[PDB]
């Protein structure tokens, strides 16, 4: 038969196809180190991570 929805391979796909206004999103979850941020980073309403 022909498969339409499968629990096959996961992860990132190699190649994307777009057609007139369609979009996509990715999520990158970063796990930081133990002491990457100090208290000098809190200057205002949000800590800057750049």
């Amino acid at each position: 038969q022909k498969l339409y929805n499968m629990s096959g391979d996961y992860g990132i796909p190699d190649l994307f196809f777009l057609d007139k206004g369609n979009w996509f999103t990715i999520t990158v979850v970063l796990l930081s180190h133990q002491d990457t941020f100090t208290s000098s980073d809190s200057q205002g309403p949000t800590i800057n991570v750049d």
């Binding site: 000098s40 809190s42 309403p45």
Partner: peptide, 13 residues
């Protein structure tokens, strides 16, 4: 001397 807290955030913009 040193700061007693690592961070204090809010959303009052």
């Amino acid at each position: 001397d040193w700061c007693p807290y690592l961070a204090f955030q809010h959303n009052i913009h």
